[PDB]
């Protein structure tokens, strides 16, 4: 019927003055654009078909051509920024927003999907979709007493499109648009479906990726306990965005961080800091570094939850990017912690893995480590035991590495290293 038409034939059918001929040509275009190996998006665009598709979105009496043109345009809009731009340039945004009210769920859903691709291009099209008024009819689709009565695929598409309206920076989404979306997001964050949860978490992770007032908007909605619960999920597609959101939240104020600690997040980090997925380990350690940058009572809760040995472990053996995050966690800890907290750190075995990382070809981690060593030496001086620490550092090979760094081509490196040798090894 409509499989493997030529673009020439699609054009001839869409140019006929016969709505049913147009419908069949539009379906043929949809099937072309729905094949996976290199759909001819640019050939369709060049044939001038986008404005016809867009005008078909308004044909209320031929709902199949609304559906077929919506799908065709969705797949064009899923392409490069230039292809998405051709869809927007054809007037598609207000036509899709009008389609959100279609009595045919499959057509409404297709408009949701299209708007998600357009908004997902970037900040400017995201904000243009918002200016045309997409948010109110999108949210109205979710204004039911129990989300479980909506079709699963429909709900997943709505969640994904809403997460694209929360996404991207420079600029972040408008504050009022965020406030309007957030209660529906909180509700989706409690829905039982794994993909709805994953995409809800992604949305929250976008919204918390920014200055403290943005984080506060999210935290004051009370979602942190639910984020921590999802941090413990078995599905990696959920843990990844949930951990990202928690990490973002702990880049804020110590009071925001404290919400994360009070919700029980620290009890999941034994698993996270040993997780077989390298990126989970890395982002868990990043999160820990922004918790050891906090107050001494927060550092103390890291101690009480037994996480210091887990930081020793990721410093000892992990992917290098994780090890560097662990170096940051350690210097933050040593810079902010009490003397007894730093003593405890050393008794957990931090010194040797810290020293072994002075062999690394990355001058930034070397600076971080040297700074940590100075902080620890300062605790030792406050205890009159700089010498025992000097011995400990030498007996594990650390001094060789430090003086090797005296002749390092980076400046603050050899300055800090030299300083250390003058002050502590003579």
């Amino acid at each position: 019927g409509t499989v493997n038409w030529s673009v020439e034939d699609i054009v001839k059918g869409i140019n006929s003055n016969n709505l049913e001929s147009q419908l069949q040509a539009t379906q043929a275009a949809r099937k072309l654009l729905s094949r996976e190996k290199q759909p001819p998006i640019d050939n369709i665009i060049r044939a001038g078909l986008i404005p016809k598709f867009v005008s078909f979105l308004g044909k209320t009496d031929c709902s199949p051509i609304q559906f077929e043109s919506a799908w065709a345009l969705t797949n064009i809009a899923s392409g490069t920024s230039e292809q998405t731009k051709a869809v927007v340039d054809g007037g598609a945004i207000p036509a899709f927003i009008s389609l959100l009210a279609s009595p045919h769920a499959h057509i409404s859903e297709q408009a949701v999907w299209a708007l998600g691709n357009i908004a997902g291009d970037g900040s400017a099209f995201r904000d243009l979709v918002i200016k045309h008024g997409a948010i109110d009819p999108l949210l109205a689709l979710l204004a039911v007493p129990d989300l479980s009565t909506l079709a699963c695929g429909y709900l997943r598409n709505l969640t994904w499109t809403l997460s694209n309206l929360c996404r991207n920076k420079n600029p972040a989404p408008p504050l009022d648009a965020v406030e309007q979306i957030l209660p529906t997001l909180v509700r989706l964050l409690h829905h039982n479906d794994p993909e709805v949860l994953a995409d809800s978490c992604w949305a929250i992770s976008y919204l918390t990726d920014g200055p403290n007032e943005r984080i506060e908007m999210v935290v004051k909605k009370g979602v942190v306990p639910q984020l921590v619960k999802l941090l413990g999920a078995t599905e990696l597609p959920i843990v990844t965005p949930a951990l990202r959101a928690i990490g973002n939240i702990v880049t804020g104020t110590d009071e925001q961080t404290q919400k994360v600690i009070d919700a029980g997040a620290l009890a999941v980090f034994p698993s996270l800091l040993t997780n077989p997925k390298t990126n989970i380990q890395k982002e868990a350690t990043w999160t820990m570094s922004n918790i050891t940058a906090g107050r001494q009572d927060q550092i103390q809760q890291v101690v009480n939850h037994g996480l210091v040995p887990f930081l020793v472990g990721v410093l000892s053996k992990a992917d290098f990017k994780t090890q560097k995050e662990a170096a940051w966690a350690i210097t933050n800890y040593t810079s902010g912690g009490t003397v007894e907290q730093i003593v405890y750190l050393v008794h957990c075995g931090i010194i040797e893995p810290l020293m072994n990382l002075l062999s690394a070809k990355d001058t930034k981690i070397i600076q971080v480590i040297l700074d940590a060593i100075s902080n620890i030496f300062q605790a030792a001086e406050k205890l009159g035991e700089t010498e025992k620490l000097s011995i400990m550092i030498e007996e594990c090979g650390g001094l060789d590495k430090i003086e090797a760094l005296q002749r390092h081509e980076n400046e603050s490196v050899y300055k800090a290293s030299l300083n250390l040798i003058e002050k502590y090894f003579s």
Binding site: S34, P39, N75, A77, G120, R167
Partner: peptide, 6 residues
């Protein structure tokens, strides 16, 4: 970020 319907 973007996804086609297949």
């Amino acid at each position: 970020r973007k996804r086609p319907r297949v």
